[PDB]
Structure formats: structure tokens, C-alpha cells
DNA sequence: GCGATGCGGAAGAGAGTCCCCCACCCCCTTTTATAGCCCCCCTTC
DNA sequence: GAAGGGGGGCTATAAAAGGGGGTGGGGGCTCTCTTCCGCATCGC
């Protein structure tokens, strides 16, 4: 009764269904992302790119492009270089 | 290389340790050197050579690992050892090593012999080096290679059976399977109903007589073309159900489907196609615990 | 008898305690023979 | 008052028998024919 | 409420389009000899 033949694993169809139901992140307009981007900066002075993506819910490439124009990367030797939401 | 015998094949007399001309008996060259180990494998082993390099490793390297420290000189000022092993394995070799580990893990799940694993490892190396499937996950390639190795060895496993032992789904295995065949410019013989009878019937715990009856029923049904276009696994599951119901050891459709990986509806449909000609399909010398007339009608 | 005096001959045969104590004495000779082969061998090499 | 040093004893070696970033590719989607397979809901009694 | 039935989705096939996300590949046991330390000794 072990390793019974199966077309797809139950854990895999659920994850596939969840990904399909959620759908891919859409590329929103720059103005809305900027407004949401700066509102996030208010809560925390420093933000990680991986965590920042979740707040913005935007594609990584699109978020980086908009963040690159205004945001800058500050190198921290303690952990790693992260992004700065302050334009200056 | 006898001077007086152009193009003569010298014969090695190992006991005498020399190469001789078979024609004149002249001894040519120096003493034959035994290229094997100078020690014997029978206190510590007096070996001065490393373990054999893995044949299935593109640009496979050879290296030594630093052992555990013993004295205080081996340890840094604060505990941790100053001499620590470093990861010097190539990315290509590291990925290939992980795939072989995955190939063996899947094979052990369904108790595949080591020869099939070795064939799978060779298949993965060719696909990995050919690099037509570089876009696909290595586990899917390994799962597809495992499927192909079973077919090449004459003991096919169903895509569902391979998927059960693999995190990769059946669809992704089937897709990588097609690409691997294209990349390798190789083919696999078509599966027949008899390629699964031994495993399916043994897993269902059916006697040899019932297994033989199921093997005959499926083979005869295919020859009679009573199940055109049906998957061979569906035909075999229906044949096993027919043979099982005609003997003392009776198995339900759910039982046969679970081992066969076929939904009970599919077994019902295939069985319904071969049920009308049940007496013709059964072997002549079959002892019917349940008469063929009283076989289930569904 | 308690401390390993065998009052029997080999022809007469040893009593179970004598047999065991005799085995204890014999083991000493076997240990010496194994020891003597290597202990003296090193001395011979160094002298040479 | 102000330094300076050889020997015994103890200790100690040394030999013998991970987390991230950057290409590159696949799938998301649409259309259609084909057919076996299988999930899901419905229906039967 | 178990079981069969019906309907529909999944599978593959080509192809185009454009972008997000997944995947893989770099990178910040005994004996003997030697060495070091504490001590008491003189010397200046
Ligand atoms: Zn000759």
C-alpha cells in the first residue's frame, strides 16, 4: 500500500491550484506604486527587498526599476546590502 | 614486436612475467609490470591509492578532505577548528551528484535493482551533458530518465508509479520523457499488457494461475482488438479483474486500481469491452471457481 | 588444593579445579611464547 | 640598595613496538481537432 | 448513504504574442629526550 501510483501528489495540486487562484502579480502604474512605496517607508526606516516586494505586491523587476530611480542601496557589513527608500 | 616477425601478436606469459613471440618464442621487451595494486587486501590497510573516480562525472575531479582535529594546535584560539573542509566541487558535478542521489532514492522506494539505477545514471549524464533539457528541473529529468531506464531494461513502470516515488508530477515526467528521447535520438519499445502482469498480480497477491489467466486474457483481448485505443495498463487492470473474479482470490476494482494506478471507472469500461467474449479470452486449462457465465456483468 | 597444587599425575587425570588451575598455568606459557617472539626480535635488530 | 643566573622538577613532544543576485527558459493565455482518462457532482435505489 | 452514471476538465499538437516566475549557476602504550619555570644562590 506504499507509494501507490498517482498522476499528481495531493500537496502539489493544492499548491498549483493556490498559485493559479492567486494569479501572477500585475504591474501597476508607477504613481500608485510610489504612493504605496513611500507609505511603507513610514512604518520602518529600512526595508528588505524580499519583504518590500510583499508589501508592494509588484513584480520584482518592475519594483527594482522604480526603486532604482529613487531608492538607493546601502551596504551593511553586519548582514548584507539592502535598499534605502529615502531618495537622498 | 619480434624483429623477425613483422606484424606478430606477442603473447603475455604472466607467470614468467615476459612477452614472447608466438612463432619463434623470442622474448621481446622488458619484464611485464603488474599494473594492479602492489599490496593485498587482507592493523590498517596498506593502500596508497584513492577510491576509484566516479565514471559518471563530467570533468570529475579528485580531492582529499581534511580530517577532524586531534590536538590543541588543530583548533583556533576559540574552539572552532582552523582547518575546515572547503566546497571545491564543480557546480555541474555538484548538480549531477545530487541527481544521482535522487535517482537512487526513487529507485529504493519501488525496490528497483541497481542495474536499472546504473542505466538511469548513464541516461541522466547524457541528457545533462547534451543540455537540451537545461530548462527543466533536474528531478524531472531524473524521474524521466528512471522511467526510460525501466523501459529499456524490459521492466516498464507506469508514469504514475514513477510519479509516486518522485515529487515531480506525471505530466512533467511525461514531458521530460519525450524531450530525453529526442535529445538522445533513442526510442523505447511499446509497452504491452504483459509488461505489468507480474508486478500488478504479485502486489495484489494473486496466485500464479490467476496471473497466467490475466496475462492470457489481456494478450488475447489485444490480439482480438476488443479494446482498441485503450491504454495497456487499463487493459491489464481489467484483465486482472476478470481473472481475479474467475478464481477464489477475488479483488475489487478499487483494489486493482490502487495497485494498477487506474481509476475504477476505467477498469469498468475496459472490463465491459472484454466481458462479452470472456470464455474465448480465458486459458483453456483454467479452473473456474466462479463459472465464466456467472462472471460480474458491469 | 585451593591455590593450584595438582596432586594428580597426567595418567591419573586432573580434577576439575586442578584442570582449570593447570589451564591458568599453561596460559602463561602461551602468552610468553607470543611475547618472546617479538620482545627478542627487536633486541636482535638493534644489536645488528 | 640593586640587579643577574644555573639547576631540579615538571610538562610535553616524539619515536619504537549560508544566503543572496544574475542569466535563461517555461508557462501563464487564446484558438481548434482528436480520444482515453479521470475528477466531481448528480442521481439512482 | 453506497454505488453507478453523466458531464466536463486534462492530457498533447502546432503557433504567435509579452511578462512573471521557476530553475540553475556564481559570489560576498612505554621509554627517552628537550624546553620552560621557580628557586636560591651570589655578585655588583
Ligand atoms: Zn619471433
From Swiss-Prot, chain A:
Transmembrane segments: none annotated. DNA binds at residues 77, 79. GO terms for molecular function: DNA binding; RNA polymerase II general transcription initiation factor activity. GO terms for biological process: positive regulation of transcription by RNA polymerase II; transcription by RNA polymerase II; transcription elongation by RNA polymerase II; transcription initiation at RNA polymerase II promoter. Its main location: nucleus. Belongs to the TFIIF beta subunit family. Heterodimer of an alpha and a beta subunit. Interacts with HTATSF1 and GPBP1. Interacts with URI1. Interacts with GTF2B (via N-terminus); this interaction is inhibited in presence of GTF2F1. TFIIF is a general transcription initiation factor that binds to RNA polymerase II and helps to recruit it to the initiation complex in collaboration with TFIIB. This is General transcription factor IIF subunit 2. It comes from Homo sapiens. The lineage of its organism: Eukaryota, Metazoa, Chordata, Craniata, Vertebrata. The chain holds residues 151 to 238 of 249 of the full protein.
From Swiss-Prot, chain B:
Changing residue 48 to A/E/K: Defects in transcription start site selection. Supports a level of transcription equivalent to wild-type. Changing residue 229 to V: Inhibits interaction with TBP. A zinc finger (TFIIB-type) spans 1-29. One of its GO terms (cellular component) is cell division site. GO terms for molecular function: acetyltransferase activity; DNA-binding transcription factor binding; histone acetyltransferase activity; nuclear thyroid hormone receptor binding; promoter-specific chromatin binding; RNA polymerase II complex binding; RNA polymerase II core promoter sequence-specific DNA binding; RNA polymerase II general transcription initiation factor activity. Acetylated. Autoacetylated; autoacetylation at Lys-220 stimulates transcription activation. Residues 171-175, 231-234, 265-268 are annotated as: Core promoter DNA-binding. It catalyses: L-lysyl-[protein] + acetyl-CoA = N(6)-acetyl-L-lysyl-[protein] + CoA + H(+). Zn(2+) binds at residues 2, 5, 21, 24. Its EC number is 2.3.1.48. The modification Phosphoserine is found at residues 52, 58, 74. It is an enzyme of class 2 (transferase). Changing residue 182 to E: Reduces interaction with SSU72. Inhibits interaction with VP16. Inhibits RNA pol II transcription activation induced by VP16 but does not affect basal transcription. Changing residue 277 to E: Inhibits interaction with RNA polymerase II. Found in a ternary complex with TATA box-bound TBP. Part of a TFIID-containing RNA polymerase II pre-initiation complex (PIC) that is composed of TBP and at least GTF2A1, GTF2A2, GTF2E1, GTF2E2, GTF2F1, GTF2H2, GTF2H3, GTF2H4, GTF2H5, GTF2B, TCEA1, ERCC2, ERCC3, TAF1, TAF2, TAF3, TAF4, TAF5, TAF6, TAF7, TAF8, TAF9, TAF10, TAF11, TAF12 and TAF13. Associates with TFIID-TFIIA (DA complex) to form TFIID-TFIIA-TFIIB (DAB complex), which is then recognized by RNA polymerase II (Pol II). Found in a RNA polymerase II initiation complex. General transcription factor that plays a role in transcription initiation by RNA polymerase II (Pol II). Involved in the pre-initiation complex (PIC) formation and Pol II recruitment at promoter DNA. Together with the TATA box-bound TBP forms the core initiation complex and provides a bridge between TBP and the Pol II-TFIIF complex. Released from the PIC early following the onset of transcription during the initiation and elongation transition and reassociates with TBP during the next transcription cycle. Associates with chromatin to core promoter-specific regions. Belongs to the TFIIB family. This is Transcription initiation factor IIB.
Amino acid at each position: 500500500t506504499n507509494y501507490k501510483p498517482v498522476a499528481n501528489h495531493q500537496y502539489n495540486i493544492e499548491y498549483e491550484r493556490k498559485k493559479k487562484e492567486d494569479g501572477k502579480r500585475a504591474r501597476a502604474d508607477k504613481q500608485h506604486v510610489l504612493d504605496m512605496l513611500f507609505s511603507a517607508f513610514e512604518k520602518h526606516q529600512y526595508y528588505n527587498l524580499k519583504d518590500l516586494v510583499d508589501i508592494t505586491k509588484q513584480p520584482v523587476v518592475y519594483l527594482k526599476e522604480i526603486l532604482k530611480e529613487i531608492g538607493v542601496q546601502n551596504v551593511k557589513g553586519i548582514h548584507k546590502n539592502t535598499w534605502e527608500l529615502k531618495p537622498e | 614486436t619480434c624483429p623477425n616477425h613483422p606484424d606478430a601478436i606477442l603473447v603475455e606469459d604472466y607467470r614468467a612475467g615476459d612477452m614472447i613471440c608466438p612463432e619463434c618464442g623470442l622474448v621481446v621487451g622488458d619484464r611485464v609490470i603488474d599494473v594492479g595494486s602492489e599490496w593485498r587486501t587482507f592493523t590498517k590497510d596498506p593502500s596508497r591509492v584513492g577510491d576509484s573516480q566516479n565514471p559518471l562525472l563530467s570533468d570529475g575531479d579528485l580531492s582529499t578532505m581534511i580530517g577532524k582535529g586531534t590536538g590543541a594546535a588543530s583548533f583556533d584560539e576559540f574552539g572552532n577548528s582552523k582547518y575546515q573542509n572547503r566546497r571545491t566541487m564543480s557546480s555541474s558535478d555538484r548538480a549531477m551528484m545530487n541527481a544521482f542521489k535522487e535517482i537512487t532514492t526513487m529507485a529504493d522506494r519501488i525496490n528497483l535493482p541497481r542495474n536499472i539505477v546504473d542505466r538511469t545514471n548513464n541516461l541522466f549524464k547524457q541528457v545533462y551533458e547534451q543540455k537540451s533539457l537545461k530548462g527543466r528541473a533536474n528531478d524531472a529529468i531524473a524521474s524521466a530518465c528512471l522511467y526510460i531506464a525501466c523501459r529499456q531494461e524490459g521492466v516498464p513502470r507506469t508514469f504514475k508509479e514513477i510519479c509516486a516515488v518522485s515529487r515531480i508530477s506525471k505530466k512533467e515526467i511525461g514531458r521530460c520523457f519525450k524531450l530525453i528521447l529526442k535529445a538522445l535520438e533513442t526510442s523505447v519499445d511499446l509497452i504491452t499488457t504483459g509488461d505489468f502482469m507480474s508486478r500488478f498480480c504479485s502486489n495484489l497477491c494473486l496466485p500464479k494461475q490467476v496471473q497466467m489467466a490475466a496475462t492470457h486474457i489481456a494478450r488475447k483481448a489485444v490480439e482480438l482488438d476488443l479494446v482498441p485505443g485503450r491504454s495497456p495498463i487499463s487493459v491489464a487492470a481489467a484483465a486482472i479483474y476478470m481473472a481475479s473474479q474467475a478464481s477464489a482470490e477475488k479483488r475489487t476494482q478499487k483494489e486493482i486500481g490502487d495497485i494498477a494506478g487506474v481509476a475504477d471507472v476505467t477498469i469498468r469500461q475496459s472490463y465491459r469491452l472484454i466481458y462479452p467474449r470472456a470464455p474465448d479470452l480465458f486459458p483453456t486449462d483454467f479452473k473456474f471457481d466462479t463459472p465464466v457465465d456467472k462472471l460480474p456483468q458491469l | 588444593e585451593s591455590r593450584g597444587f595438582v596432586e594428580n599425575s597426567y595418567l591419573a587425570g586432573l580434577t576439575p579445579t586442578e584442570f582449570f588451575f593447570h589451564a591458568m598455568g599453561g596460559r602463561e606459557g602461551l602468552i610468553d611464547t607470543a611475547v618472546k617472539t617479538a620482545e627478542t626480535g627487536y633486541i636482535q635488530r638493534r644489536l645488528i
